[PDB]
Design a protein around this ligand. Sequence first.
Ligand code: HEM
Ligand SMILES: CC1(C)[C@@H]2CC[C@@]1(C)C(=O)C2
Length: 405
Amino acid sequence: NLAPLPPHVPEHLVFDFDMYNPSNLSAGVQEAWAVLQESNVPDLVWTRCNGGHWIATRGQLIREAYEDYRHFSSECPFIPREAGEAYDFIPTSMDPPEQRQFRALANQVVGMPVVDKLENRIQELACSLIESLRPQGQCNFTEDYAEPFPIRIFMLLAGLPEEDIPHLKYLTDQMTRPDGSMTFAEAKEALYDYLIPIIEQRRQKPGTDAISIVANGQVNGRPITSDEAKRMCGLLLVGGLDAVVNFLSFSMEFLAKSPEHRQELIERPERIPAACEELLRRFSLVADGRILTSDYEFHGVQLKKGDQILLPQMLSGLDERENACPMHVDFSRQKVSHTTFGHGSHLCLGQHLARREIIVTLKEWLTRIPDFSIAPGAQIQHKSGIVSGVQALPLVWDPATTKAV
Ligand code: HEM
Ligand SMILES: CC1(C)[C@@H]2CC[C@@]1(C)C(=O)C2
C-alpha cells in the first residue's frame, strides 16, 4: 500500500521503506534498517509507505533535524499521521519553550536522584530473578527476565499493581509495534481509562509514588491539570515499559552468540560501562520523527509544511560516517557515537534509569551464568516499529557451569 507520490517529491528521492515491515528482517532489525545507508540511497528519501513520509538516513541530518525544533516540530511525532495526530503525550508532543516546565517535573520523577534511591531494589530484583533462573538451564529471556526486571521496578516506582502488567504491556505494545488489532487512538484511550481514576485519587490522597508527584506538581508557577498529569503519566508508562525490555533482548541475544565478548566483561569488569555504551549504539531500537511547520529547504530538498519526516535514532550510530565498522561490536572504540536516547530538547530523561538496569543485568547475569547460548533450533524473530523488539529469546545453559552467589 503505496500512497501516490505528492507533487513536490522528486522521483529520484523515492525509496519505499516500511518502518513497520522492512525487508531483510530475517537478518536482524538493525541490519534491515541499514539498507537505508547503502550507497545507492540518497541521505533523505521519501517512502510511499505508511501514507508517505521523509526519512533522514545520516547521523548528521538526524541530529540537525533534532536540534531544529522551529522547522521540525514534535506535535505529530509518530508515523502514520493518524497516530502522530492522536499523539498527545507530554513533554513529547510539545516544543520548547513550553516543553521545559513539563520536562522539569518529569525529571523530578525519573532523574538521577531517583535512580540513586532505587539502585538497591534494582540490584535486589536482578539477582533474585537470575538466581531463580540459574538452576533451570533454560529460559525464555524475553518473558523470564527482560519483561519482569524493568517492568516491576517501574510498577514499584509508579505505585501500580503488578497485577496490571499484562494489560498495560499490551496497550504499550500497540502504540510502538501496532498489530492491527487496535488503532493508536483506541490504545491511547484505553490507557487513559486506566490512568484517570488513579490520577483522581492521587490528587486527593497523594503518596510518594511517581504518579502522585506528577498529579500534584507545579508547572510555570501554577498547578498541573488532571489532563496534563494524564498526559505525562501515559508517557512515563510507555517510556518505562517498552524500550528497556526490548534493549535487553537484543543485547542478551548478542551475548548468547559471542563468547569472546562475555569473557571480556568477566575479566575486565571496568569495561562494562563502555560495553553498555557500545551495545546502546549497536542495538539501538527507537525510530520516531517530526512534522514540518513550514516550507523548508533542508540539504537541498524542499520539505512542505505538514510533511512528516522520520529521523531514526537507531540510525546515527549505525552510520559509517560516524562509526567505523558499525555492525561490529567493539568494547574499546575510542568514540561510541550514538543518538540512542535521542538528541536535542527531547533527550531521554529515563536515560539514567535505563543504563543502571543494563549495567546491573550484565554484571549480575555474567556472574552466575557466564556461559549460555541460544537454544538449538530456535529461530529468533525481530519486530520493527517505533520501538523495535525481539519476540522470544530461548536460552540454554548447563547449570553445572553456573555459580550461585
Ligand atoms: C534503552 C532504553 C530507552 C531508549 C532507547 C529511549 C529512547 C528515547 C528517545 C529516542 C527519546 C526521544 C524521543 C523524541 O525525541 O521524540 C526518549 C524520550 C523520553 N524517554 Fe526514553 N528511552 C528509553 C528508556 C526510557 C525510560 C526507562 C524512561 C523512564 C520511564 C523513558 C522516558 C522518557 C521520557 C520522559 C522522554 C521524553 C522527554 C522529553 O520529551 O523531554 N525512556 N526516549
Ligand atoms: C520514542 C519513545 C521511545 C519516547 C519514550 C516512549 C516513546 C514511544 C515516545 O512516545 C517518546
